[PDB]
Design a protein around this ligand. Structure first.
Ligand SMILES: Nc1nc2c(ncn2[C@@H]2O[C@H](COP(=O)(O)OP(=O)(O)O)[C@@H](O)[C@H]2O)c(=O)[nH]1
Ligand SMILES: Nc1nc2c(ncn2[C@@H]2O[C@H](COP(=O)(O)OP(=O)(O)O)[C@@H](O)[C@H]2O)c(=O)[nH]1
Ligand SMILES: [Mg+2]
Ligand SMILES: [Mg+2]
Lengths: 186, 191
């Protein structure tokens, strides 16, 4: 059993990301996610090796807003227990959504050098960043990932090549999930 | 307060009242604007095991509303099946005005318990829309659901999910619900 929280502002592409991570295909008709949605990634630990083993990784998309009232956040807090990894999702076209990752992470880790829970920062809508602005956008997200002591992936969740097997993105994703499993069990 | 995870599946046909039931069980209020549930929805019931005794211990019980249809294609049920692992209890939900939804509970249970005397996972059968049953016919409906619940070796609760008093503390419903969750916890942790 493995529980990975998927955190981020509404509209950044969480449901699309989760769908790609669990089904290797693009989420075609994303609807507004009500409540906590859970999808399972059938994950090959140490993929491609003779010690390959299957784990069911639960991706918990709990939802909500960092601008919610205190009482709303307290009810959300019961979902943040027994967490084995966290994916922090931001929309690369919306600087507000990456800033809000600091609020999201504090909600969990207080209700970063000392944090032992593996973290992964994912920027979505990379396709929407003009080549003109890519250097500036990505320099900032590097600072973001370092603050969390986290690896970073930037991708287009609506392009199935984003996580194609053997791609650089797919390799980093497998490394993160293997680290989640290792810190939980080994 | 306990970091120990407890997983209870909530199974039943679309439209029987799963989301309304779960909302009442987790939020102590009626679900006012039920929408069509997409994919797997999870909510948490904070449960005091052996409440009121010196062994009282709080557990977070996850209610997993996985969804789908017993008529889905083989490939759909195969992907759904990965949601049925590490299960500590099952709530089987049927709509008391819809006899087909009760019959389909046999299919739902087979989907899980293949991926009833020998089953070790605690089961609870919950019939909804009791308010929609004519008072004349309530006795007849409840005789039938009693036999249904016996087939599953399960306790049964019948209620109106839109009446918040259905889960009133100390009521017959609340006692049976606590007994079920205590057995779920006991079979996982104190067995
Ligand atoms: N162009 C583009 N659109 C995206 C990307 N990721 C998500 N979307 C779109 O952004 C909208 C919000 O995505 P959704 O997954 O529902 O976001 P959520 O509210 O965080 O779960 C949807 O219309 C998606 O199709 C991406 O990488 N590129
Ligand atoms: N009168 C009555 N209506 C109910 C009851 N349970 C559910 N409903 C209604 O039945 C419809 C379907 O309920 P819902 O919770 O969405 O079912 P689901 O598809 O199983 O999640 C909704 O309009 C509910 O308001 C009940 O016990 N009594
Ligand atoms: Mg969503
Ligand atoms: Mg529903």
């Amino acid at each position: 059993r493995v529980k990975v929280l998927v955190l981020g502002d509404s509209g950044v592409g969480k449901s699309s990301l989760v769908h790609l991570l669990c089904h290797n295909q693009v989420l075609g008709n994303p609807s507004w996610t009500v409540g906590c949605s859970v999808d399972i990634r059938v994950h090959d630990y140490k993929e491609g090796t003779p010690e390959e083993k299957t784990y069911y990784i639960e991706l918990w998309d709990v939802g909500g807003s960092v601008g919610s009232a205190s009482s709303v956040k307290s009810t959300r807090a019961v979902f943040y227990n027994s967490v084995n990894g966290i994916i922090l999702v931001h929309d690369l076209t919306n600087k507000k959504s990456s800033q809000n990752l600091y609020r999201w992470s504090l909600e969990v880790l207080n209700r970063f050098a000392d944090n032992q829970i593996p973290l992964l920062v994912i920027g979505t809508k990379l396709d929407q960043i003009h080549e003109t602005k890519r250097h500036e956008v990505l320099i900032r997200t590097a600072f973001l990932a370092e603050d969390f002591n986290a690896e970073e992936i930037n991708l287009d969740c609506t392009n199935p090549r984003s996580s194609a097997a053997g791609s650089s993105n797919a390799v980093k994703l497998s490394r993160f999930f293997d680290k989640v499993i290792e810190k939980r069990y080994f």
